[PDB]
Structures are given as structure tokens and as C-alpha cells.
Amino acid sequence: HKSEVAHRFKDLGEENFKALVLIAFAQYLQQCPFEDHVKLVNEVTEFAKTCVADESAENCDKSLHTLFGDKLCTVATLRETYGEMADCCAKQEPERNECFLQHKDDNPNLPRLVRPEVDVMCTAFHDNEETFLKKYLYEIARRHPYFYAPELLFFAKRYKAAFTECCQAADKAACLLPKLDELRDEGKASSAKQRLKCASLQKFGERAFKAWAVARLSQRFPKAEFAEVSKLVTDLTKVHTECCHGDLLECADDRADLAKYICENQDSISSKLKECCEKPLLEKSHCIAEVENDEMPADLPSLAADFVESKDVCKNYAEAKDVFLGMFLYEYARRHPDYSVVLLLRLAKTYETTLEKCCAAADPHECYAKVFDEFKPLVEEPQNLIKQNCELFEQLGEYKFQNALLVRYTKKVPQVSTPTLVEVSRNLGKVGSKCCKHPEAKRMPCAEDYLSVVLNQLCVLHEKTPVSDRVTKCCTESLVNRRPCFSALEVDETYVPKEFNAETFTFHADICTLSEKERQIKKQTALVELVKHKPKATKEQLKAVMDDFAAFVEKCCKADDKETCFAEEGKKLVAASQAALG
Ligand SMILES: CCCCCCCCCC(=O)O
Ligand SMILES: CCCCCCCCCC(=O)O
Ligand SMILES: CCCCCCCCCC(=O)O
């Protein structure tokens, strides 16, 4: 066109336009004050309007990149607030922007964001909802500089809706709070999955990512043709590459184009792309990305036919080893939307391995014959894992469930810090409630989805401060094998118990007046230390100590005399127990 600005303005809309302009400036200039950005966004929104009136207007022709970088350098403090960054402003653009991208901090040093009181929020909301929302958007944006802007703007709207529906309720806290807590987990998972994808794309390479994308796309569009899927796995991979790099404009467009393409060729891909394809430009890609699995064709051959019996398996495989393996995935994946992608990748690598051992010997069509027999154990393991954990989560609550995990993982890796153990066992438990809620069909995939980021967080920390060689083995190990590795660790027999400390087992009646949250975290932290001290304790010897401690609290946090019963009856328990546990 002529005016790239006008086009995007007209396209996006004043409302979404200003929101994104802010998020953008916020992600680059993570240090300037809110008041500073609003001024920028306004100066910018005013310009764009100029172009929407007359495209020939000065600069209305300039490239978005050029215009953007021009304003960033309009920041005087730049040199003292950012210093080195102010140096980028001295280059021709290809480099100037490339320069900017570099000085983007992934993990800056800002004060953790504290959640005000429901009523303080609801009032701020009502008084001036624009600057209240804009201000909070600016706070999130600057802390997560690589979060895909449009997706962030999409959470924003989900936030604006919780306050709208809740701030008008009798019990605003019972309404809002459980909503903010959810939005928080989702937003945190989302940012972790993005970061996780770029990490793997660089660590493991284009091949692995393409293999992942194939199995992934085959489950959703089981009707599209492998040629169609390859077309998409190719573009898709190009999209993450650019998005990961950091350029929002490039990333934004790449996503736009691929979304349009998918829509025009709807029929060739899936039947469920109905809604997503009618939605506006800003929601299309996101919608499609979340879309539901199209139904898998009823009449289709068997796999053993084309991949087990066939005496060409080796001829076609050697002709092009990757295109053939991708076919196996495409074929196996669209037949199993109930499998986790990592399970699929686990099979493809098992197939690839035997295919290499058999196409090089006597009579292969007989070497790789008992291959599907090798898949059984691989499949049965995660399945049984889900069954056993969802069946137990049904016997004990989410809390009494998390505790069981606590015991399990502390015995596996006692070395791990206690606050870390709790955080992890906590998260895992939550994964237990959102996934065990689906039928045997959507379980495995649900689990892998959450587990991935959870497990990755565990490694990200451990990375910073290693503590166990065992976690490091599983963590730096195969991404496809991370989970299995951990489920594999056995009770650490090496580990030498920690010296007793009653201070660590000194509870004061304050626990009587603590939110169910702090109450648990309190009892749960003790539980961890308890096992770190006596790791050979049984579930019997432990269910006992836990139950005794159970009634105990009811006896003093409800007695006319409090902190006494907590010091007299307590002295008795730490004693009875100390002995009960050899
Ligand atoms: C912002 C990255 C923080 C990582 C935390 C991931 C959220 C845990 C997922 C969940 O249990 O709901
Ligand atoms: C294992 C091959 C690496 C491909 C990267 C896939 C990362 C997706 C992580 C997830 O969301 O679960
Ligand atoms: C230190 C954190 C403990 C790691 C737990 C990893 C989860 C594996 C799932 C399971 O087998 O239950």
C-alpha cells in the first residue's frame, strides 16, 4: 500500500491499536514510567489518524519498523536510563532494529507485582477503568517482553470481564479471586510454553520441531493430506522461528498470512475451522491455534500393512528417510488424538531405530516384523500412569492428593529445596484436577500439556542452582524422555537424613488464623521436612503421624487456652512420633 500505518489502523481499530502500541513500547522500553508511554501511544495514535485521513501525509509512507524506531529514539533519557541501547539509534535500520531486539531483557529486575484488595481494585476499576487497565497492561508487558502482544491483549480482555461481572456482585471476593487465580495460571503456563518452544527449537533443532509439529497437526486435521500437512508444518516452523527471534511485526504477519491460507483452503484441512475463519484478523490465528480436533475418517487401512509387512518399507525409507518417517507420524497421529505428542515421537524414534538395524541384514521383512510388539510397553506406561493417578485423586481430595505427591517426590530427590518441592507438588496436583476431569480420551494430551511447563520450570530453577545429579540427568536428557526419566527415579538410598530440629516442628496457634492456603503450605512444608529426616518411614508409619497431627490442631486451635495446648500437647507429639519413627 502507501500508508502501512493507516492500513493497520483501519484494519485493527483505534481501541486495539492503542492497546498494542502500548504493549509494544512497554516491551522495548521496560524502564520508562507509565505516564511516559501513554504520551507516546497518544502521539502515535494521533499520527496514524493523520494518515487515515490522507495517505500522502508526511511519513505516512515510512515503514512501521522505521517509524517505530524513530519514536523510540525520541526518548532523551534513553542514554542514561538505558545507556548502551541509546547507541542503536546511530545505525541504518536493518541494524537499528536488530540492535533493539538484542537489548531486550528476558528476566529483568522489577518488584514483584502485588495483588491489591478486591475492594480497592473494584473501586479503581469503576473510577477510571481505562487508566486502571492500561496501567496493569503496562506492568505485565514490561515483565514478559517476549509474550506475543496480541495474545497478551487477549488476556487483558479476559481480565476486563472478571471485574465487570465480579465488581457488581454481593460477594465480590468469592467471585473475582477464583477468576484471577485461574487467569494467572493460564497466563503463566502460556508464557512458559512460548519460552519452552523457542528453547527447544534452538536446543534440538528444526528437525525435531518439525517432527513435533507433524504429530501435532495430524491429530487436529486428520482429514488433510500429508502433502497439506507438510505445507503447513513448513510454514508453521517458519513462524516460530521468526516469532522466537523477537520481531513482532514479522511474527505478526507470518501468523496472519498462514491464518488466511488455512481459511481459504478450509475444506482441505478441517471441518471445525468454521468459527475461527469468520472471526476478525486479530483473533483468527489464535482461534485456529486452539481449535478442536476434526473427526478422523472412518475407513482407513492398517499401519502394519504399509510399515510392517511391506517389502519396500526399506526401499521407500532409504529413498527419503525423513519424508517416510514423517509419514509414519502423520499416519499414526491422526489415528491417535488420544496419545500425547511426545508418545508419538517416542514411537517414531523407536521405529526409526529398528528400521536402521533391520534394513542392514539378512531378511529385514522379518527383522522389523515384531516391531509393533515393541510399541505396547511404550504406550501402556503413560496410560497406566494416568489411570493410577486419577483413580487415587478420586479417593483423596486435591489437597490430600498433593500430599501423596509430596511424599513420593521427596523420597525420590530429598536434595531438592523444600519450597521448590511444595511448589512443584502443588502444580502437579492442579494438573490432576483439570485433566482427570476429562474422559479417558482427552487425559494423556491434557497432562503432557501442563506437565511440560511444570517440569521445565523445575529444570530452569535447578539449572540456576544444581542440587541433584539425577534431576540434571533427566532435565538435560531427551525432551521426549524428561517425564519418563522422572517417573523412573527410585527412592534415594544414598541420601543421609537431616539432624532433628523441633524448631522446624514448632507450630504456634497462628495456624488457626491463616487462610486455608497458608494453612496447607504450612502443614505441607512440615510434611516435607518430616520425610527429609526419616526417608525410610512407611506410608503406614506416616499416615499415623499425619493423622495424630491432624486431630492435634483441632485440639488447640479450638481450646479456650491456645498457644499453651500448642506447646504442651505439641511437646507430647514430637515425642510420641520421634519414637514411632525408629
Ligand atoms: C510465567 C512462567 C511460570 C511457570 C509456571 C507455570 C504454571 C503452572 C501451570 C499450572 O499448574 O497451572
Ligand atoms: C521434543 C522435540 C522438541 C519440539 C518442541 C516442542 C515443545 C512444545 C512443548 C509443549 O508445549 O509441550
Ligand atoms: C523434584 C520434583 C519431582 C519430579 C516429579 C516429576 C513428575 C513425574 C510424574 C510421576 O511419575 O509422578
Instruction: Report the top-level CATH class of 106-195.
Output: mainly alpha
Pair 357, 367: CB distance under 8 Å: yes
Fold of the CATH domain 493-575 = Serum Albumin; Chain A, Domain 1 (1.10.246)
Regarding the beta carbon of 204 and ligand 2, being less than 6 Å apart is answered yes
> What is the CATH code for 295-380?
1.10.246.10
Assess contact for 88 and 100: CB atoms under 8 A: yes
CA 86 – ligand 3 centroid, Å: 46
Q: Report in angstroms the alpha-carbon separations of 425 from 287, 404, 475, 495.
A: 32, 9, 17, 20
Cβ-contact 374, 420 below 8 angstroms: no
Which residue minimizes the CA distance to atom 1 of ligand 1?
188
| 140 contact partners, CB below 8 Å, separation of at least 6 | 113, 147, 152, 155, 187
- Considering only CA atoms, which of 37, 32, 6 is closest in space to residue 19? 37
- Written as one letter, the residue type at 519 is R
Residues 6+ apart with CB under 8 A from 327: 226
**Is the C-beta atom of 487 inside 6 A of ligand 3?**
yes
Q: What is the resolution of this structure in A?
A: 2.5
Query: Which fold, 381-492?
Result: Serum Albumin; Chain A, Domain 1 (1.10.246)
Q: If you write DSSP's letter for every residue of 223-277 in order, what string do you get?
A: TS-HHHHHHHHHHHHHHHHHHHHT-HHHHHHHHHHHHHHHHHTHHHH-STTTTTT
Task: State the cell numbers at 107.
Answer: 528476566
Please name the residue whose Cα sits nearest to atom 4 of ligand 2: 209
Closest CA to 399 of 431, 417, 426, 436: 426
Q: How far is the CA of 375 from the centre of ligand 3 (A)?
A: 23
Architecture label for domain 203-294:
Orthogonal Bundle (1.10)
Please say whether the beta carbons of 118 and 176 come within 8 A.
Answer: yes
C-alpha 204 to ligand 2 mean position (Å):
10
Every domain range in the chain assigned CATH 1.10.246.10: 3-105, 106-195, 203-294, 295-380, 381-492, 493-575
CATH of domain 3-105: 1.10.246.10
How far is ligand 3, taken at its centre, from the CA of residue 389, in Å? 12
> What residues does ligand 1 touch, defined as CB less than 6 Å away?
185, 188-189, 191-192, 427, 430-431, 450, 453-454, 457
Q: 209: which residues sit within 8 A by CB, 6+ positions away?
A: 197, 200, 201, 237, 240
The rounded distance, in Å, linking the Cα atoms of 470 and 473 is: 5
CA distance 581 to 545: 9
Q: Would you tell me the crossing angle of helices 443-464 and 469-476 to the nearest 10 degrees?
A: 120
Q: HSE, CB side, 13 Å, CA atoms: give it for residue 82.
A: 22
In contact, 393 and 401? CB cutoff 8 Å: yes
